[PDB]
Every structure is written in C-alpha cells, then in structure tokens.
Amino acid sequence: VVIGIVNNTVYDPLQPELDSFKEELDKYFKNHTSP
Amino acid sequence: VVIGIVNNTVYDPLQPELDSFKEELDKYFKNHTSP
Amino acid sequence: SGWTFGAGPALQIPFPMQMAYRFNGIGVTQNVLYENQKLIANQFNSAIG
Numbered sequence: 823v824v825i826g827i828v829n830n831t832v833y834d835p836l837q838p839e840l841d842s843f844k845e846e847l848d849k850y851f852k853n854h855t856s857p
Numbered sequence: 858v859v860i861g862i863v864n865n866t867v868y869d870p871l872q873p874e875l876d877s878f879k880e881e882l883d884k885y886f887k888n889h890t891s892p
Numbered sequence: 893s894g895w896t897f898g899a900g901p902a903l904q905i906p907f908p909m910q911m912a913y914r915f916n917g918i919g920v921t922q923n924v925l926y927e928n929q930k931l932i933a934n935q936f937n938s939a940i941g
C-alpha cells in the first residue's frame with residue numbers, strides 16, 4: 823500500500839542472541855542419542 | 858490500592874517467540890527421553 | 893470531557909482518569925495517582941476549602 827518502500831533485511835536481535843546459545847543447544851540435544 | 862481495577866489476562870509478547878521455541882524445545886526432549 | 897471540547901467534537905472521559913493523563917505531561921508517570929487517590933482527593937478537598 824505504501825509507496826516508496828524498499829526491499830531490505832532487518833537484523834532482528836532476539837533470535838541470534840538466542841541462537842548463539844541454541845547452536846550448542848541443538849548440538850547437545852541431537853548428539854545425546856549418537857553414542 | 859487502585860479502585861475500578863478489572864480482571865483480565867494480558868498477552869505477553871515475550872512468550873510466543875520462545876513459546877514456539879518451547880514448542881520445539883519440549884519436542885527436542887521427546888526424542889531425548891524416548892530411549 | 894477534558895481538553896477535547898477546545899479542539900473538535902467533545903469526547904466523554906471519567907474525571908479520576910483525566911487526572912492520570914495530566915500527570916503524564918509533567919514528568920511523573922500515571923502509576924502514582926491511582927496509588928494515592930484518597931490522599932490527593934483530601935488534599936484537593938482541603939485546598940479548595
């Protein structure tokens with residue numbers, strides 16, 4: 823609807839500061855059944 | 858202390874982006890506690 | 893009605909709630925009036941006497 827709007831990404835902050843800890847959370851959850 | 862207060866629930870915006878994570882966090886322990 | 897009657901159409905609004913919208917333009921938040929309604933009522937009632 824609005825004219826002049828441009829296409830760009832927005833670095834939403836809450837996910838990657840979580841994903842800095844979700845990466846080791848995802849590593850720990852899936853590798854628990856590995857051995 | 859306040860008069861005229863009305864009982865209601867408030868939709869917490871800090872929940873659902875991590876409740877969706879909590880939807881998949883508890884899913885990540887379904888496989889963890891399966892064997 | 894508050895201040896609206898001086899702009900356009902007059903909208904009704906409860907007076908114990910107009911005041912919490914008149915603290916907010918000073919610098920003190922509105923979570924002070926409700927917590928002190930009775931004392932401010934007596935201070936206003938005694939001041940006009």
Ligand SMILES: *[C@@H]1O[C@H](CO)[C@@H](O[C@@H]2O[C@H](CO)[C@@H](O)[C@H](O)[C@H]2NC(C)=O)[C@H](O)[C@H]1NC(C)=O
Pocket residue numbers: 827828829
């Ligand atoms: C911003 O991106 C969207 C999609 O990434 C663009 O929308 C597309 O526009 C083309 C132009 O013909 C269409 O053919 C596509 O079907 C559209 N896709 C979608 C999903 O809507 C949009 O044009 C981009 N805006 C700008 C200013 O580049």
Ligand SMILES: *[C@@H]1O[C@H](CO)[C@@H](O[C@@H]2O[C@H](CO)[C@@H](O)[C@H](O)[C@H]2NC(C)=O)[C@H](O)[C@H]1NC(C)=O
Pocket residue numbers: 864
């Ligand atoms: C607002 O909700 C709270 C809690 O849901 C109510 O507090 C209790 O309500 C039950 C049900 O009426 C009473 O039996 C209890 O005695 C209440 N607790 C206390 C400490 O009084 C509260 O009554 C509700 N208020 C309104 C106006 O509905």
